[model samples]
Target chain A: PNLTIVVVSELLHTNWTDYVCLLESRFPDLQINIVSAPQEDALQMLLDGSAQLALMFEREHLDNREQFVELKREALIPVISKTHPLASQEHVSYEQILGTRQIVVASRDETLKPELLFSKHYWRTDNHHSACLMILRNLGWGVLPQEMFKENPELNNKLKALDVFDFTPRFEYYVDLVWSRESELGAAARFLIDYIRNKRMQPAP
Target chain B: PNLTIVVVSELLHTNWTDYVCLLESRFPDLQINIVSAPQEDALQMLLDGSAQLALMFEREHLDNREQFVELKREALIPVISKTHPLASQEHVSYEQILGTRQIVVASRDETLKPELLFSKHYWRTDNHHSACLMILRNLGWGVLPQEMFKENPELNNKLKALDVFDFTPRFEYYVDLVWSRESELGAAARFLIDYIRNKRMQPAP
Candidate 1:
């Protein structure tokens, strides 16, 4: 049976593509259709039965009909361009960050939480990479996934993490493999879930 | 005056951000707001008077009420992972590419043109970056802007351009600075267009 999985584009780039590649290699005959969307649309597709599963970050308010398998915890770090005014400082406060423009990752249909909107002047994009590009241009500062920098280490030369006081150095959240509780899992979806779970249990070589 | 310009997120990363940064530096007092969206939405925002201008590819059926200044011509080259089965070949045919899965960039509300839908089995995303990531994973092959590789040269090591016998090596199109013909251009918008036009006329130092 054909299986469709929806994933947020940024997570697909930074974290999940390798595992997907591995899954394809391990099961040569399995047909997996990967759909990339923003987090909200990814979850919506799964909930609406348009997709069999979704690989996304765990949200604060998950629907009762939805369930997830935690893949791993990832951290979002505050960052600024090397040339940003705040870059040379030892540490900046949330107030300082609030005074300057912020680049935020926000879906078209979703309103950002107050905690996420620290600045009065801010630009919003739907993906992390665009936020990084804006930051690199010294357009503004933003919080980005730690895994993003790890995947593209060269970005470190152009950007540096901001040591923000009175704020968690990193916002931690779980990356999850989510699905609808009411739908029966297809063989391919079940295999994918089991494979990822077992892979997480085993240490990477 | 406050100016809001809509740009497709991919082009912002590949071609326009540096120019925008230059504009910011040259006019420190100008309040320029950048909004990133898909091509259709970018044009829609300009049409609806929500944005002052749009930086996007020139479309075939431009609205009668719209006008544009051509920025430059960019090529879209077909690319595949270094490890793709066709990568070993000196040249491939359109038929060969059609037989393999194709990764395509398509916004949620847009229907792809027949020429763009060359493969029966394809995955679709809204941005070029996600399509590139899918190709890099050897999931499928896709067409990407030449400027994208020029911006991220390291991608060359992981993916290579495909030489198709019956197809042009590159599908070329014009990038434009578009605005509604019905509206008066704001000072900021005019400055942006003139700056880009003059920049294009002059040789880079």
Candidate 2:
């Protein structure tokens, strides 16, 4: 009844709904599904076999040593609301831009902790990109890299793109295909891995 | 005069003090420093460069990313205290793990939410391993992988290993390793990274 894949960001940002829609629209024959979970829960989701893939952070690349995990590829697309002022600009400074709206991360950035200290008002939420949407629809300043927002693009404004500064604190949401090394690949999972790999490698138009 | 590192963990569990001791003892030629800050204050520590690293979990991790900050390989490691009843049992199920003592995570883990379905006593402390330590010290049970405990092997006597379970809810902590990937590596940082990475790769024999 369910074939699940997970992501760390909110459903809204990942444009997962769109991905799902596109997947269904484009690959209707495949019986595939996505089980949206926050980055952390995604781990349990995959470990429990509820999800076939786990979308986690960059350092997660190291998790491969733990076995049963594989890094698919790297993703880099900018996320900004079409309505954002920078929508016309190609990019923005990684530093000048803080977690203006929201961020999906494996852990806190040891580097940026001081300026944007933690608080109840500004925290991590996974139900959906509700906070990001709220900020984008209202505040119009948040931004993110494509991989984090991979599933759902609609929530992001048709925004701009720019190379983040070297120290801009890039996030790596490793698209992990979690199967025991001994297990045979399922047809559905193989397709997803291929599809995601293609999506990540897709060049800008 | 000060070489401080911010962390969202209990001093008792993380034992940052030991690093300072080692730095002072072995590298008397180097000026050692530590500007103590609460685990929550890690944001300030990294952003302000007041400390070399921001030690915290996802609550801090997610927030830091929102602002473009980054967390480095503040690795994960399993830990427990001798006080725990199961500390020596060698193997146990998650249900078996549900024994009376409550599980305390870094106060940061509490921010992860989703407590309604998981462990009965998922809690927050300062850091993840320390949280494990808190549980073990309380004669309660908890498990960390072999990474987060990388810095503190001494905590081992406080807790013992339960075979890596078929399933254990694992949460990671991303600690700061200053440079922002922008600044050139200082000898101290290069040393720290090598020291940490070497420790991580080394087996826990």
Candidate 3:
């Protein structure tokens, strides 16, 4: 009758709702439950027999690769709002970005590196949408998922991408669909898995 | 030489930085460590000796009154960006609001009622500032801390508040400074706590 898709908050913030609409239209009778939570918590939910499948990022340091559906590797672009003071620059030098505030999705773990700062502090949060908001407010510049801006036309119009010099900042941005091998996916869940495999991670045109 | 103040995200979103400036001005040699996290996690940090003091909302059902200094109550108001389609409204009814998309801070629980269909899918997030971003993008309207808007002049100019009818929409908004009595506070920690007690939760005039 229904299926549950528990996704990590990071991926959920991207464009999960768009895919939800596609899934709903395809399977008229199918009810889809979407739970967005932290990656560790989502993985726990999958292991506990409470959730059918999970969509999350791959952590290199972590383990277990049973049914890993490798999604596309995305590009992270350093961007700022079009109206920001730094927006006019075609490319930004490290020195130019040093004096400006930096907004980011990663927290202390990333900040601990001595190379990432000119100032002693940066605003960090796991909430990517808010990070975009902070950037739009001109609080700072950031590296946002390119797919996010590509998917959201309004955001694309509002922001300008900058070529970052001194550092070619990029993340593997590998998203994966995984599950506990012991538990068999239900019909709806299997259908979604198949649909997602064919569709991959690309947004509908 | 140093002090730590653990604050709930709700209170942190308010004017926490203003007090930090004040603390730094008053105690020039003092170093301030601020931890902004969820209420329960902050509370655990306090009880487990990891944190010296915590500022958080007072839950009515909660206990352990020792060292709990009650802070002021703040008003919650319904708000929207000036550019939103619904911004012209002087006031809004429950039915009127039902048709509009809703945004809010993530709360501990949800109310389940079949008739609340239109609002069953309200956008909930812990990122209050980003919530403002969502509103500014005209994605939806939200109920926000009145002081949060008042303190940020740019945000104040960008958003408008509407009197909500049919639903009074008020929260107790009582904040508290709490710590474990079992632990002995250092001179710096005690001084900071005393300073906060005198200052309370009200924003500066």
Candidate 4:
């Protein structure tokens, strides 16, 4: 039997790699398929039964038929290139951020929240990797998961995380392992759910 | 005057950052805005006059009003994770590639060539970064620009570039600096055109 999991591209790149690696080792015979997409598209794949499981951010509202398990919490830190005008500041105000351009990761379905658009001028893309690249080029400032820089430590030299005053400072969100309540899980899928849930209780080596 | 450029996201992330950085340093007073999108959307913005310049692949059949300047030639190499079943082979045939699942970077406009789809099973995404991530996870094999791994050297440890026999093996394409010939170029835009064209003549240090 095969288990198909759809994950938002950011987490797929940064966080889920190790989990998938472990799964492959534990169940060598199990066939695992991973699909990567934006948050909205990932959820749509889960709802439509194309994917047996989905890894995405916890939404403000979920369908009653959906079930979510918290995997981890992440902080989205506002980052700017070292060459950016505001990179030297110890801290910036919300007004300063609004004055500069923002690079936003927009959802294909137009479901992004209004609050994320805080800047007067903005460029939008569908994935965080592209956002990181734009920010590294000194094109604009944007928020990204700290884990991204952790995984690619060399990026630390090129980017500086800003401490913002009189603003949210950091956006917090939970990465959830989600699935539909209406579908029947196969043995392979159930074993994966148990393995991931159990593994989260202990620190990964 | 402001100059706006729309670039395909893959190049924006991998190849264009240094060029953009050089432009910023040379034209300190110029207000440059970059919009990143998929190839089709980038060309649409160029045609609709939302952007003064576009950086994308040279299409087979270009509009009569458009002009393209070749920036560089890139080869799309087939790659797989080190742990993949066929990673040990020094060379593979087209039939072997067709039997394995292929991760494809599908254009949003459904303009991808049918020849690119060689596998019996495949998963599709709109950008090469996501496809690279999926390949890194040992999900399947895919073709990506050699420049991608060049920009991120650490990835070389985990991915193996394949040598395939009895097939096209490598797909080559040109990255073009494009604009509509119908539009009049501004001073800043014209200066940028000359700078990039001249820069390509000598080896980039």
Ranking the candidates on lDDT from highest down gives 1, 4, 3, 2
Which lDDT tens digits does candidate 2 get at residues B110-185? 4444542234543333233323433543534454545434423445545565555335555444444433333333
True interface contacts retained by model 1: 0.35
Query: Sorted on DockQ, highest at the top, how do the candidates line up?
Result: 1, 4, 3, 2
Could you tell me the lDDT of residue A180 within candidate 1? 89
Candidates 2 and 3: which is better by DockQ? 3
Q: By summed lDDT, which 10 consecutive residues of candidate 1 chain B come out lowest?
A: B164-173
Residues A48-162, candidate 2, lDDT per residue (tens digit)? Answer: 6656654554344335422333454454443445565645556655544553433322133332233332222233222222223333442333335464343333433344444
Full-model lDDT for every candidate: 0.73, 0.43, 0.62, 0.72
Residue A111 CA displacement from its true place in model 4, Å: 9.3
Query: DockQ of each candidate's interface versus the true one?
Result: 0.36, 0.01, 0.11, 0.20
Off by over 4 Å in 2: A1-205, B1-3, B7-30, B52-91, B108-118, B127-138, B144-158, B168-172, B179-205
lDDT (10s digit) by residue, model 3, range B56-161: 7765524563377665666666777788767766666667778776666643334222332335345544545545555666766776777665545566778877
Model 3 has an lDDT value of 0.62
Give residue A172's error in model 3 in angstroms.
Answer: 6.4
lDDT of 1 by residue, A30-149 (tens): 556666666777777887888898878757566888888888676778789998888878877778888888878765425455676678777766667777877988888888888776
Candidate 2 vs. true structure, TM-score: 0.32
- How large is the interface RMSD of each prediction? 3.3, 20.0, 7.7, 4.5
lDDT of 3 by residue, A70-160 (tens): 6656566777788887777677676767867666554234323345344444555454654565576676677677766554556777888
Q: Judged by lDDT relative to the true structure, which candidate is superior, 1 or 4?
A: 1
